Amino acid sequence: HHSGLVKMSHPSGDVEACMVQVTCGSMTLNGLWLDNTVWCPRHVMCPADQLSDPNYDALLISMTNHSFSVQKHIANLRVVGHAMQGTLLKLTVDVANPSTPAYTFTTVKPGAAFSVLACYNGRPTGTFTVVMRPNYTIKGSFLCGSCGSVGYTKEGSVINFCYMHQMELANGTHTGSAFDGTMYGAFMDKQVHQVQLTDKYCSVNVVAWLYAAILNGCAWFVKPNRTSVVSFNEWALANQFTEFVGTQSVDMLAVKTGVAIEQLLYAIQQLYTGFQGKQILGSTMLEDEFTPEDVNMQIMGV
Amino acid sequence: HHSGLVKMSHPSGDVEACMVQVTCGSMTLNGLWLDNTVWCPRHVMCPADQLSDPNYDALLISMTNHSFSVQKHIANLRVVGHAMQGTLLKLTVDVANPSTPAYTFTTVKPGAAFSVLACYNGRPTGTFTVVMRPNYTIKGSFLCGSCGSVGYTKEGSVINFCYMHQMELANGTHTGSAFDGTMYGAFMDKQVHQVQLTDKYCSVNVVAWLYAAILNGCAWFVKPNRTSVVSFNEWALANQFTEFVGTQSVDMLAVKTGVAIEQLLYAIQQLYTGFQGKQILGSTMLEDEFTPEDVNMQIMGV
Ligand SMILES: *[C@@H](O)[C@H](C[C@@H]1CCNC1=O)NC(=O)[C@H](CC(C)C)NC(=O)OC[C@@H]1C[C@@H]1CCC
Ligand SMILES: *[C@@H](O)[C@H](C[C@@H]1CCNC1=O)NC(=O)[C@H](CC(C)C)NC(=O)OC[C@@H]1C[C@@H]1CCC
């Protein structure tokens, strides 16, 4: 049996039309062209002999406008202003992007899903979706040249940009910047190995996945037994789970299935000790990479 | 540790610009507008009281050109010709799509991956990737109104359309048409429960995933022991695996890792009996949803 769940990304065309290439004579990476601004990682300024401890303030002053070459392949855009905001550059260009979508900037929270457009040399090459992990990394797929690839959510026609790719950690996961220039987590945009915080299971997404199972007629793990949210969250802190915070999206799943949240918090406690050979939606481990909204949308059509 | 593998779709913008809505006064579904042609499922002609046993030949003759209303939301396209090819309609329209990409039609083979653009009422809503299963179904995510959603691969700038969505089977999987109008597998485009063939593990993709593990420093399952392709394929037939056929993509992985294909065919035989508590890339079961090409591209940058 198939659950009807896939890793679903937004259609990428609106964002594809915003991707450019940015070069300072060192690395070439990607930028995001909205209105008269091009956003890109500030380490485009860094020579390779300084990637481990750049002085970005001095690099910024050493640049002039025409130090930045911005090109669109899928135009040449003349840079007429430059500024640094945290770990990002804000380049002002002479031409407004005629395909600028309606957009906002937002920060994505752990457990929430977003779509990534992986680009190299200004050329979109693939799209995928990830959830922001509790330790502010993502389990992505990025190679040399991908920095400046962007992540986003979409509300109606409005694209909410939330991520600009910066680096890969030694454990293969990834992190980047929000468009206020902050790195997600405690990470720095310097080529040195960094403290990595412990990851956790995202409890609300595990609950969503158990609801997805019920919605597929798979409910062997449901018992009348219940664990309260407060009791579950005390347990969570000692067992590598995030604290559970319910939402309207989760409540819709409880209403549709007739199964209470607290029944699934009990189920999680028991399943975490082991599935005892049984499977849920073809898996022998808890799944936390699907959100309540994924389940509402993909299965219930909401 | 994260493998660096995600479910990666092509960027969808080129195909988004080809999607339209098609209505006959009964259901509304999606069509694909290339040059002066709109392709769509032929059950757009079917009234709901006949979805279980349509006479499509008589339905086709009962239609005239202006019976078909074709609309683009993301134009009204006047239909000036109509024809049926297998399970698809080929509508000729008065305007050539100015955003027609370079394209071909192809049939996708079991184990191969392709990108899907899920659409409703002519509006793209998400994208995902699937592998064609050995029983000619896909494990997709489709709801009422999604028929006419398209699947494709991409070679350079050329989009190879391979799938037009038609139906969901009782086990939650999906199937559809190639653009020669044939349904994948033995399926018919009639709303009746149908014989479903047994699925199998795609051996070449399991081998690719074991190579992905090695490429991530995870090689506990590699032994000098070897099983030949011919011996493995005899075993495969009795154990719910496809017969293995090597390719240049797999050979590149063997060269990069120094691990022979036959070592991994032996590994699969042993792992299929059980992982004995150990995990591979965070999984306790064999993974066959990633192709040799996925691994070459996402991990090796080829
Ligand atoms: C984009 O420039 C690039 C994206 C990385 C490359 C490989 N996979 C990625 O996601 N980013 C970088 O190369 C980083 C530049 C610094 C200055 C922010 N560095 C980086 O990601 O280093 C990764 C290697 C694993 C070790 C960690 C740092 C010692
Ligand atoms: C598009 O029109 C639609 C797509 C289905 C709807 C629900 N999920 C899908 O993928 N296709 C249909 O409704 C099919 C039309 C026939 C005439 C080809 N029918 C169909 O998919 O029926 C599905 C229900 C599960 C039972 C199987 C048939 C008895």
XYZ file of C-alpha atoms and ligand atoms in Angstrom:
662
model
C 0.000 0.000 0.000
C 1.148 3.558 -0.730
C 0.304 6.409 1.660
C -0.174 8.996 -1.041
C 2.628 11.065 0.506
C 5.521 12.344 -1.570
C 8.086 15.044 -0.964
C 6.225 17.857 -2.699
C 7.883 21.103 -3.698
C 6.222 24.242 -4.978
C 6.394 24.769 -8.716
C 9.704 26.545 -9.211
C 9.132 28.721 -12.292
C 8.506 32.017 -10.490
C 11.804 31.652 -8.596
C 13.755 30.361 -11.627
C 13.110 33.728 -13.262
C 14.893 35.436 -10.354
C 18.171 33.503 -10.357
C 21.385 35.125 -11.576
C 25.124 34.424 -11.427
C 27.391 36.640 -9.276
C 31.186 36.686 -9.581
C 33.849 38.796 -7.840
C 36.779 37.204 -9.676
C 37.096 34.459 -7.042
C 34.177 32.060 -6.703
C 31.082 32.262 -8.821
C 27.865 31.612 -6.996
C 24.175 32.394 -7.381
C 22.107 35.423 -6.534
C 18.440 36.287 -6.237
C 17.213 39.235 -8.323
C 14.100 40.966 -6.960
C 13.101 44.490 -8.063
C 16.436 46.405 -8.289
C 18.272 44.221 -5.753
C 20.453 41.113 -6.082
C 21.009 39.121 -2.889
C 23.953 36.745 -2.612
C 26.276 35.215 -0.002
C 28.979 37.558 1.099
C 31.725 34.960 0.684
C 31.585 35.691 -3.045
C 34.079 38.397 -2.033
C 36.436 36.015 -0.332
C 39.594 34.715 -2.043
C 40.150 31.011 -1.430
C 43.228 31.689 0.734
C 40.956 33.463 3.255
C 37.777 31.332 3.349
C 38.680 30.027 6.823
C 38.876 33.480 8.499
C 37.735 36.276 6.191
C 37.589 39.863 7.345
C 34.350 40.608 5.573
C 34.256 44.273 6.659
C 37.616 44.892 4.975
C 36.623 42.824 1.932
C 33.464 44.924 1.567
C 35.389 48.191 1.618
C 37.865 46.755 -0.884
C 35.071 46.238 -3.413
C 33.622 48.806 -5.760
C 30.376 48.464 -7.672
C 31.990 47.125 -10.819
C 33.877 44.482 -8.806
C 30.591 42.541 -8.869
C 29.675 40.937 -12.193
C 26.008 39.877 -12.270
C 24.741 37.829 -15.229
C 21.428 36.190 -16.123
C 21.593 33.174 -18.466
C 18.190 31.449 -18.440
C 21.373 39.890 -19.386
C 24.346 41.622 -17.821
C 23.161 43.615 -14.812
C 25.231 46.669 -13.899
C 25.762 47.005 -10.145
C 25.174 50.583 -8.967
C 25.270 50.069 -5.187
C 26.450 47.457 -2.692
C 25.845 46.815 0.999
C 26.374 43.976 3.445
C 23.671 42.703 5.757
C 24.940 40.028 8.095
C 26.072 37.138 5.902
C 24.469 38.465 2.700
C 25.266 41.109 0.162
C 22.553 43.408 -1.160
C 23.635 44.548 -4.627
C 21.661 47.332 -6.271
C 21.425 46.916 -10.035
C 20.365 49.254 -12.825
C 17.494 47.066 -14.147
C 14.484 45.936 -12.150
C 13.661 42.264 -12.660
C 10.543 42.304 -14.872
C 9.592 38.853 -13.559
C 9.752 39.770 -9.870
C 6.975 37.800 -8.163
C 4.956 39.046 -5.252
C 7.208 38.186 -2.329
C 8.112 38.531 1.321
C 11.045 37.509 3.446
C 10.412 35.211 6.387
C 12.331 32.966 8.749
C 11.353 29.322 8.771
C 11.004 27.488 12.095
C 12.175 23.987 13.018
C 9.855 21.291 11.699
C 8.475 23.494 8.931
C 8.901 22.534 5.286
C 10.188 24.672 2.451
C 11.127 24.260 -1.209
C 14.693 24.702 -2.465
C 15.815 25.583 -5.976
C 19.330 24.216 -6.361
C 21.317 26.301 -8.826
C 24.849 26.291 -10.240
C 26.424 29.197 -12.181
C 23.058 30.943 -12.172
C 21.313 27.979 -13.786
C 18.524 26.158 -11.910
C 19.260 22.447 -11.870
C 16.817 20.806 -9.466
C 14.211 21.333 -6.831
C 13.519 19.521 -3.585
C 11.835 20.091 -0.217
C 13.259 19.839 3.296
C 12.109 20.511 6.820
C 14.222 22.828 8.979
C 15.739 20.556 11.595
C 15.612 21.340 15.326
C 19.373 22.054 15.164
C 18.908 24.564 12.306
C 20.420 22.445 9.604
C 18.680 20.926 6.621
C 19.235 17.539 5.007
C 19.775 18.870 1.518
C 21.709 18.068 -1.630
C 24.239 20.745 -2.473
C 27.625 20.740 -4.152
C 30.386 23.254 -4.785
C 28.872 26.198 -6.630
C 25.413 25.930 -5.095
C 25.677 28.780 -2.645
C 23.044 31.380 -3.232
C 20.478 28.697 -4.014
C 17.256 29.763 -2.358
C 14.547 28.265 -0.229
C 10.982 29.498 -0.027
C 7.387 28.821 0.970
C 4.349 30.094 -0.918
C 1.065 31.579 0.315
C -1.242 32.081 -2.611
C 0.802 33.815 -5.293
C 3.226 35.254 -2.706
C 6.637 33.668 -2.439
C 8.120 33.842 1.063
C 11.879 33.580 0.727
C 13.373 32.010 3.816
C 16.776 30.492 3.001
C 19.921 31.288 1.040
C 22.406 28.446 0.937
C 25.854 28.912 2.526
C 27.589 25.735 3.650
C 27.783 22.015 4.335
C 28.660 20.610 7.731
C 30.929 17.648 8.351
C 27.925 15.349 8.915
C 26.598 16.083 5.424
C 23.838 18.453 6.472
C 23.505 22.032 5.289
C 22.799 25.505 6.502
C 22.387 29.007 5.252
C 21.017 32.475 5.857
C 17.675 34.118 6.238
C 17.242 37.266 4.187
C 17.851 39.434 7.228
C 21.416 38.117 6.891
C 21.411 35.934 9.998
C 22.647 32.374 9.705
C 20.198 29.776 10.922
C 21.374 28.437 14.263
C 24.733 29.412 15.743
C 26.638 28.888 12.488
C 29.233 31.227 10.969
C 30.018 31.657 7.264
C 33.663 30.667 7.643
C 35.324 27.524 6.338
C 36.080 25.908 9.686
C 34.528 22.927 11.438
C 31.860 24.115 13.857
C 30.037 22.871 16.937
C 26.987 21.017 15.751
C 23.994 20.901 18.017
C 22.099 17.717 18.593
C 19.186 17.046 16.295
C 15.830 15.779 17.580
C 12.688 14.156 16.244
C 10.066 16.782 15.380
C 7.136 15.553 17.446
C 4.416 17.488 15.636
C 5.542 15.989 12.308
C 5.619 12.464 13.768
C 2.035 13.023 14.940
C 1.147 14.201 11.418
C 2.614 11.029 9.949
C 0.679 8.816 12.367
C -2.470 10.663 11.281
C -1.465 9.998 7.665
C -1.290 6.320 8.574
C -4.793 6.371 10.098
C -6.093 8.196 7.030
C -4.764 5.229 5.014
C -6.540 2.659 7.226
C -3.350 1.859 9.192
C -4.210 2.252 12.877
C -2.842 -0.788 14.727
C -0.838 1.537 16.985
C -3.878 3.506 18.175
C -5.009 2.623 21.704
C -7.503 4.352 23.998
C -4.467 5.126 26.154
C -3.540 8.812 26.168
C -0.603 10.994 27.201
C -1.211 14.668 27.893
C 0.774 17.316 26.040
C 2.398 18.462 29.266
C 3.416 14.909 30.234
C 4.634 14.147 26.722
C 6.780 17.273 26.639
C 8.487 16.366 29.907
C 9.198 12.970 28.337
C 10.334 14.584 25.085
C 13.143 16.485 26.775
C 14.746 13.237 27.977
C 14.218 11.262 24.757
C 15.523 13.324 21.830
C 12.109 14.736 20.818
C 11.018 18.313 20.409
C 8.280 19.553 22.645
C 4.883 19.207 20.987
C 2.895 22.346 20.146
C -0.441 21.674 18.512
C -1.863 23.765 15.702
C -5.111 24.163 13.789
C -3.653 21.904 11.085
C -3.166 19.079 13.588
C -6.639 19.655 15.033
C -8.158 19.130 11.539
C -6.480 15.734 11.386
C -7.836 14.795 14.826
C -11.326 15.824 13.709
C -11.155 13.928 10.397
C -9.846 10.711 11.966
C -11.640 10.832 15.301
C -8.311 10.080 16.998
C -7.131 12.470 19.707
C -3.675 14.040 19.735
C -3.045 12.555 23.159
C -3.636 9.025 21.830
C -0.821 9.561 19.328
C 1.512 11.078 21.929
C 1.080 7.830 23.857
C 1.645 5.894 20.636
C 4.907 7.770 20.005
C 6.174 6.939 23.485
C 5.573 3.240 22.880
C 6.790 3.192 19.268
C 10.005 5.006 20.217
C 10.834 1.943 22.333
C 10.344 -0.152 19.191
C 7.891 -1.189 16.489
C 8.234 -4.884 17.475
C 8.536 -5.992 13.851
C 5.437 -4.118 12.669
C 5.532 -1.385 10.046
C 3.718 1.929 9.676
C 3.275 3.159 6.098
C 6.091 0.871 5.036
C 8.535 2.124 7.681
C 10.077 0.595 10.787
C 11.058 3.981 12.271
C 9.237 7.187 13.135
C 8.972 9.646 10.236
C 9.224 13.369 10.964
C 9.838 14.781 7.451
C 6.147 15.392 6.675
C 4.174 18.239 8.243
C 0.545 18.483 9.359
C -0.034 20.694 6.343
C 1.507 18.116 3.983
C -0.930 15.533 5.263
C -3.939 17.880 5.119
C -3.069 18.965 1.563
C -1.815 15.770 -0.045
C -4.245 13.318 1.492
C -7.313 15.370 2.469
C -7.143 17.948 -0.326
C -7.180 20.840 2.127
C 24.884 11.554 9.195
C 23.023 12.618 6.045
C 23.693 10.895 2.708
C 23.292 14.011 0.623
C 20.430 12.333 -1.253
C 17.077 14.034 -1.678
C 14.192 13.412 -4.029
C 15.240 15.871 -6.720
C 12.899 17.057 -9.440
C 13.762 19.090 -12.501
C 12.941 22.773 -12.297
C 9.331 22.942 -13.435
C 9.038 26.379 -15.065
C 9.329 25.258 -18.694
C 6.470 22.772 -18.195
C 4.349 25.166 -16.089
C 4.130 27.397 -19.154
C 2.527 24.524 -21.083
C -0.316 23.638 -18.714
C -3.913 24.503 -19.583
C -7.402 23.582 -18.370
C -9.680 21.436 -20.579
C -13.424 21.063 -20.000
C -16.129 19.228 -21.972
C -18.970 20.238 -19.648
C -18.394 17.192 -17.420
C -15.077 17.006 -15.590
C -12.420 19.647 -15.859
C -8.902 18.347 -16.046
C -5.511 19.502 -17.287
C -3.913 19.524 -20.696
C -0.457 20.026 -22.138
C -0.102 22.734 -24.800
C 2.821 22.238 -27.200
C 2.998 24.041 -30.569
C -0.620 23.967 -31.888
C -1.637 20.833 -29.959
C -3.252 20.274 -26.554
C -2.960 16.761 -25.125
C -5.357 15.593 -22.428
C -6.953 12.403 -21.075
C -9.834 11.220 -23.149
C -12.104 10.725 -20.138
C -12.656 14.486 -20.181
C -15.413 13.484 -22.622
C -17.025 11.037 -20.270
C -20.121 11.931 -18.218
C -19.909 10.654 -14.650
C -22.699 8.110 -15.247
C -20.428 6.345 -17.777
C -16.942 6.486 -16.200
C -17.068 2.745 -15.439
C -17.623 1.625 -19.073
C -17.359 4.510 -21.533
C -17.684 3.979 -25.253
C -14.932 6.395 -26.134
C -15.332 5.933 -29.908
C -18.962 7.066 -29.696
C -18.083 9.874 -27.273
C -15.440 11.122 -29.719
C -17.887 11.243 -32.614
C -20.414 13.006 -30.387
C -17.983 15.879 -29.835
C -17.384 18.822 -32.113
C -14.452 21.204 -31.914
C -16.254 23.763 -29.791
C -17.316 21.055 -27.313
C -13.784 21.398 -25.907
C -13.104 24.537 -23.873
C -9.360 25.099 -23.378
C -8.207 27.878 -21.032
C -4.826 29.080 -19.771
C -4.800 30.852 -16.384
C -1.179 31.163 -15.223
C -5.921 32.840 -22.771
C -8.887 31.063 -24.297
C -7.640 28.664 -26.966
C -10.061 27.888 -29.791
C -10.075 24.200 -30.731
C -9.966 23.723 -34.512
C -9.401 19.953 -34.696
C -9.708 16.909 -32.444
C -8.453 13.331 -32.592
C -8.095 10.415 -30.207
C -4.893 8.451 -29.802
C -5.300 5.533 -27.446
C -6.213 7.007 -24.064
C -5.371 10.612 -25.002
C -6.997 13.350 -26.982
C -4.967 15.480 -29.377
C -6.742 18.834 -29.682
C -5.565 21.221 -32.378
C -5.825 24.853 -31.314
C -5.629 28.119 -33.229
C -2.644 29.572 -31.290
C 0.783 27.991 -31.012
C 2.162 28.057 -27.473
C 4.856 30.768 -27.571
C 6.593 29.120 -24.604
C 6.826 25.652 -26.151
C 10.134 24.179 -24.969
C 12.311 21.908 -27.019
C 10.713 18.532 -26.387
C 10.318 14.880 -27.261
C 7.966 12.132 -26.222
C 9.433 9.027 -24.627
C 8.321 6.037 -22.595
C 9.925 5.618 -19.206
C 11.089 2.164 -18.091
C 10.713 0.508 -14.685
C 13.253 1.779 -12.171
C 13.788 5.060 -14.005
C 12.999 8.373 -12.336
C 10.941 11.234 -13.697
C 9.554 14.556 -12.480
C 5.818 15.210 -12.143
C 4.045 18.559 -12.183
C 0.812 18.090 -10.258
C -1.861 20.457 -11.530
C -5.506 21.199 -10.731
C -7.847 23.260 -12.959
C -4.883 24.127 -15.160
C -2.899 25.540 -12.244
C 0.419 23.929 -11.240
C 0.371 23.176 -7.532
C 3.400 21.019 -6.748
C 6.234 19.007 -8.137
C 7.717 15.693 -7.080
C 9.757 12.811 -8.508
C 8.943 9.105 -8.699
C 10.469 5.993 -10.174
C 8.325 3.883 -12.507
C 7.646 0.715 -10.556
C 8.189 -2.764 -12.026
C 4.379 -3.165 -12.126
C 3.956 0.089 -14.106
C 2.459 2.110 -11.323
C 3.976 5.079 -9.557
C 3.798 6.016 -5.885
C 2.513 9.518 -6.453
C 0.304 12.104 -4.803
C -2.760 12.892 -6.869
C -6.304 13.918 -6.047
C -9.532 14.436 -7.959
C -8.861 16.961 -10.704
C -5.220 16.044 -11.245
C -5.618 14.066 -14.427
C -3.609 15.514 -17.238
C -0.752 16.310 -14.872
C 2.439 15.443 -16.696
C 5.659 13.624 -16.040
C 8.937 14.258 -17.808
C 12.703 13.824 -17.873
C 15.148 16.400 -19.216
C 18.261 16.021 -21.377
C 19.977 19.354 -21.670
C 17.278 21.867 -22.554
C 15.051 19.147 -24.066
C 12.058 18.030 -22.063
C 11.108 14.392 -22.658
C 7.449 14.007 -21.777
C 6.739 10.492 -20.599
C 3.579 10.439 -18.465
C 0.085 11.907 -18.406
C -1.841 11.118 -15.254
C -5.039 9.032 -15.483
C -5.991 7.131 -12.345
C -5.414 5.847 -8.829
C -5.508 2.171 -7.960
C -7.093 0.699 -4.858
C -3.677 0.325 -3.179
C -3.039 4.068 -3.446
C -0.622 3.915 -6.354
C -1.113 5.686 -9.663
C -0.865 5.180 -13.365
C -1.277 7.018 -16.597
C -0.472 7.220 -20.284
C 2.542 7.704 -22.450
C 2.095 10.268 -25.194
C 1.571 7.547 -27.770
C -1.712 7.031 -25.895
C -0.852 3.670 -24.349
C -1.463 3.175 -20.652
C 1.565 2.022 -18.720
C 1.160 -1.643 -17.860
C -2.059 -3.527 -18.578
C -4.306 -0.788 -17.182
C -7.473 0.593 -18.785
C -8.869 4.119 -18.401
C -12.180 2.945 -16.963
C -13.430 3.422 -13.421
C -13.375 -0.219 -12.356
C -11.072 -2.113 -10.017
C -8.327 -3.799 -12.017
C -5.871 -6.661 -11.650
C -2.752 -5.256 -10.087
C 0.519 -6.942 -10.841
C 3.016 -7.664 -8.138
C 5.624 -5.017 -7.499
C 9.306 -5.866 -7.008
C 12.452 -4.262 -5.655
C 14.403 -2.543 -8.439
C 17.781 -4.221 -8.066
C 19.811 -1.673 -10.019
C 18.484 1.124 -7.779
C 19.257 -0.863 -4.613
C 22.818 -1.274 -5.909
C 22.945 2.491 -6.536
C 21.864 3.157 -2.964
C 24.503 0.806 -1.551
C 27.072 2.714 -3.616
C 25.672 5.942 -2.152
C 26.295 4.449 1.279
C 29.920 3.603 0.424
C 30.400 7.101 -0.977
C 29.335 8.356 2.476
C 31.851 6.120 4.298
C 29.186 3.516 5.189
C 30.504 0.152 3.999
C 29.993 -2.367 6.814
C 27.968 -4.553 4.439
C 30.751 -4.857 1.852
C 32.537 -8.221 1.888
C 34.997 -9.733 -0.588
C 32.230 -12.247 -1.283
C 30.672 -11.847 -4.728
C 27.582 -13.031 -6.598
C 27.621 -13.018 -10.385
C 24.942 -11.156 -12.318
C 23.641 -14.399 -13.784
C 23.429 -16.079 -10.359
C 21.855 -13.005 -8.788
C 19.197 -12.815 -11.487
C 18.189 -16.437 -10.954
C 17.868 -15.573 -7.259
C 15.989 -12.363 -8.057
C 13.171 -14.206 -9.794
C 12.372 -16.171 -6.621
C 12.755 -13.259 -4.187
C 10.680 -10.325 -5.454
C 13.596 -8.511 -7.150
C 13.958 -7.357 -10.712
C 16.734 -8.846 -12.740
C 19.851 -6.684 -12.606
C 21.098 -5.018 -15.797
C 24.217 -2.942 -15.343
C 24.807 0.370 -17.068
C 27.608 2.870 -17.587
C 26.189 4.882 -14.675
C 26.594 1.919 -12.321
C 30.085 1.226 -13.667
C 31.132 4.808 -12.739
C 30.083 4.123 -9.162
C 32.085 0.876 -9.087
C 35.128 2.746 -10.404
C 34.804 5.635 -7.924
C 34.339 3.371 -4.894
C 36.562 0.471 -5.896
C 33.713 -1.889 -4.980
C 32.545 -4.356 -7.625
C 28.908 -4.752 -8.638
C 29.073 -8.424 -7.733
C 30.079 -7.582 -4.147
C 26.871 -5.571 -3.785
C 24.721 -8.274 -5.389
C 26.009 -10.580 -2.655
C 25.322 -7.857 -0.095
C 21.722 -7.531 -1.312
C 21.159 -11.268 -0.958
C 22.312 -11.155 2.657
C 20.597 -7.871 3.553
C 17.288 -9.082 2.097
C 17.345 -11.766 4.806
C 17.725 -8.955 7.348
C 19.891 -6.057 8.486
C 20.364 -7.656 11.944
C 19.726 -4.364 13.735
C 22.228 -2.368 11.670
C 21.255 0.591 9.514
C 22.373 1.795 6.091
C 22.048 5.543 5.490
C 19.559 5.713 8.330
C 17.355 2.905 6.991
C 16.593 -0.627 8.133
C 15.257 -1.711 4.717
C 16.585 -1.722 1.171
C 15.971 1.528 -0.722
C 15.170 1.360 -4.435
C 13.795 4.885 -5.065
C 17.160 6.393 -6.069
C 18.805 5.670 -9.419
C 22.457 5.271 -10.405
C 22.174 8.652 -12.082
C 20.782 10.264 -8.912
C 23.805 9.050 -7.004
C 26.291 10.095 -9.708
C 24.719 13.565 -9.975
C 23.829 14.401 -6.387
C 26.860 12.955 -4.653
C 29.623 12.877 -7.286
C 28.579 15.966 -9.248
C 28.467 14.045 -12.516
C 28.898 27.347 -1.703
O 29.928 28.292 -1.887
C 29.430 26.187 -0.874
C 28.336 25.112 -0.698
C 28.882 23.759 0.003
C 30.115 23.104 -0.951
C 30.081 21.851 -0.780
N 28.647 21.509 -0.362
C 27.989 22.882 0.112
O 26.883 22.977 0.531
N 29.819 26.686 0.435
C 31.189 26.533 0.934
O 32.039 26.000 0.284
C 31.443 27.075 2.334
C 32.107 28.445 2.239
C 32.294 29.093 3.636
C 33.255 30.296 3.521
C 30.939 29.534 4.250
N 32.296 26.140 3.020
C 31.810 24.785 3.267
O 30.659 24.489 3.061
O 32.760 23.842 3.728
C 32.277 22.508 3.702
C 33.398 21.501 4.093
C 32.868 20.306 4.907
C 33.798 21.332 5.568
C 33.165 22.293 6.601
C 34.072 23.525 6.809
C 35.456 23.129 7.373
C -8.354 12.351 -12.726
O -9.551 12.494 -13.456
C -8.540 11.268 -11.673
C -7.258 11.124 -10.825
C -7.442 10.132 -9.559
C -8.667 10.736 -8.561
C -8.385 10.379 -7.381
N -6.867 10.176 -7.341
C -6.401 10.048 -8.860
O -5.280 9.854 -9.196
N -8.811 10.006 -12.341
C -10.042 9.253 -12.079
O -10.871 9.649 -11.314
C -10.175 7.933 -12.827
C -11.080 8.122 -14.040
C -11.168 6.833 -14.900
C -12.334 6.963 -15.903
C -9.837 6.549 -15.644
N -10.736 6.967 -11.917
C -9.985 6.601 -10.720
O -8.843 6.960 -10.566
O -10.671 5.835 -9.746
C -9.967 5.738 -8.518
C -10.819 5.000 -7.445
C -9.968 4.115 -6.513
C -10.957 3.469 -7.492
C -10.358 2.729 -8.712
C -11.428 2.559 -9.811
C -12.619 1.702 -9.323
